[PDB]
From a paper:
The Ctf3c namesake, Ctf3, is a 733 amino-acid residue protein predicted to consist almost entirely of HEAT repeats (Huntingin, elongation factor 3 (EF3), protein phosphatase 2A (PP2A), and yeast kinase TOR1 repeats). Ctf3 associates with a coiled-coil dimer of Mcm16 and Mcm22 (Mcm16/22).
We now present a cryo-EM structure of the yeast Ctf3c, which resolves the overall organization of the complex, shows how Ctf3 binds Mcm16/22, and clarifies Ctf3c recruitment to the larger Ctf19c. The final map shows side-chain density throughout the particle, enabling modeling at near-atomic resolution. We modeled five Ctf3-C HEAT repeats, which have the overall fold of canonical HEAT arrays. Nearly 120 amino acid residues interrupt an imperfect sixth repeat at the C-terminal end of the modeled peptide chain, making a helical knob. The two main components of the structure, Ctf3-C and Mcm16/22 N, have opposite polarities; the central parts of Mcm16 and Mcm22 form a parallel coiled-coil that begins near the C-terminal end of the modeled Ctf3 polypeptide. The N-terminal parts of Mcm16 and Mcm22, form a set of four interdigitated helices that pack onto the convex side of the C-terminal part of the HEAT array and contact the helical knob. The final model shows that the structure determined here (Ctf3-C-Mcm16/22 N) is essentially the precise complement of the Ctf3-N-Mcm16/22 C crystal structure.
Residue numbers in the entry:
A (entry chain I): 337 to 718
B (entry chain H): 7 to 137
C (entry chain K): 5 to 128
Amino acid sequence: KHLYSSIILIKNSRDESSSPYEWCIWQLKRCFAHQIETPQEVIPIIISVSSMDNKLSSRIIQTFCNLKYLKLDELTLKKVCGGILPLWKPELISGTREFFVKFMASIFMWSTRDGHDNNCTFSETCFYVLQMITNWVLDDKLIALGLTLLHDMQSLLTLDKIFNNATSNRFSTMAFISSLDILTQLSKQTKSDYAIQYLIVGPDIMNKVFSSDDPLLLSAACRYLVATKNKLMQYPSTNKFVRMQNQYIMDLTNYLYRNKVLSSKSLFGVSPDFFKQILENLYIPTADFKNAKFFTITGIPALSYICIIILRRLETAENTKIKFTSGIINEETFNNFFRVHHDEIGQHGWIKGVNNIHDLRVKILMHLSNTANPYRDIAAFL
Amino acid sequence: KQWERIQQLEKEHVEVYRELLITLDRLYLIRKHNHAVILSHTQQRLLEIRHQLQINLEKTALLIRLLEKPDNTNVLFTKLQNLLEESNSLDYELLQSLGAQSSLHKQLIESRAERDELMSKLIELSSKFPK
Amino acid sequence: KDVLDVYIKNLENQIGNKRYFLKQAQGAIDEITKRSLDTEGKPVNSEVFTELLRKPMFFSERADPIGFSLTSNFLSLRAQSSSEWLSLMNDQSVDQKAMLLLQNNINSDLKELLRKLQHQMTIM
């Protein structure tokens, strides 16, 4: 009952106009034009009959793409590209890089211009091609295609009608963390057979992402360096290509723990006199104002919200004592309140953080790390 | 009731800020040279990360002068406390969903590496089949 | 119920001021364009453009509804988009777990099929 869509295939041979191969592609040319019934119970038959039938799955891609059918429905080619695209192989090895780039540029010029609302039209197709790239890189003989399509895939994701703080919609950022952990799963794996050029994103399309506002892709960019620190130690780092991630580690450490961020050198490359001429026009004019302000934004260690929501839960589940009296910690609010305001009264009702701030970050930095729930974000010192 | 006015006037305000902070910086390069305004994607990024970083630095001029003193400002404290308590889906209900989808994909390609070689070997026991 | 009624006008004044700054600056965009219509202008060379990444522009002026502005247009859209992206990812995971059964029962039937056909091959 569910095999005679396979023995009818095996009966004569493959790779010719048999019964099912004509049928499914005629159903695809029928489903885009809205005259047939809605395809929610037709496309499961399609995704069943077109799983790994390579002589057929190399034929829907060259037909139902590149905007010639995309403007008709688009609510179902996304589902087709969720189906066939995670299961594909190339055999025209030279005629693919000149096809997916054109295809997704033609996605992008229609994705973010008309409608003016990214209602799940671009980035899921990027996530599906990015899922395909796992299937490509897992085999051999064509990873040189994969780690050449991946870099301009990331250089097409980081155009700034998608990624930044006016409107975000998140569909850039987790597609990007998939796009980076596929590379780090390539990184941790054994049997090195590639040059270093394939696996470092470079300061034009990673220095913009690392300065974002969501915590978890900053954790993914941390996970990159904490795993690509392996296998780049073997290459001689005497100024060939490893200078780029020396720059990236020596401003991430200068950003999140080593608070020397003001009078240092060009940290992202912005020549930090920009900071001396942007800090000096903002308010709350108290004394500790240079080192307090520019340390974090929306979620990691000092100036955040995730710090105090982990610290207040941390001390309400160890010693139920005097609760915290304000919002976000700093260098000055914690000092000038909980040293000269609860010196004797409320002295030993704390988490044995006997010093000031320099040990207050550590008694949550050894809480994000060991308990494996929230993130794994440990590129502070190392 | 009286928050959708805030949201729509808000989005218009952010868009006007975003456009002005680009055009008012291209005007400098107009006035400095004579005509001389093209720049490619090598140095477009260096002009763009700065306008990322400046608006991100203006972001932290609230979490030091508005959310230290725990007031009860109706428009400006309780909405910020109800709404910046959100983005609580960042952990397991969204991060390891991205793990589980790959953990499903790995089994789905493993269940095709069998079937492809299976049919490519099952061909050779059907043409060998005499008449 | 009245603090927000003042916050409305504090928003209106500064959004009008930013509109007027944008109109004046955009009217002064094409000032030195009419002197010699070239409209390509390649040299933006590094000796003078590196100066531009050292001085900002358009500071705030303490009335500041640009402060609260950036959060209620970011942390509403982030939460809303997450609560849609979970729905789409769970839909795809449900449909692929539906497909694993329907094409893992096939890999048994074909193995036991080619076993019996190899038996008929051996008996000829």
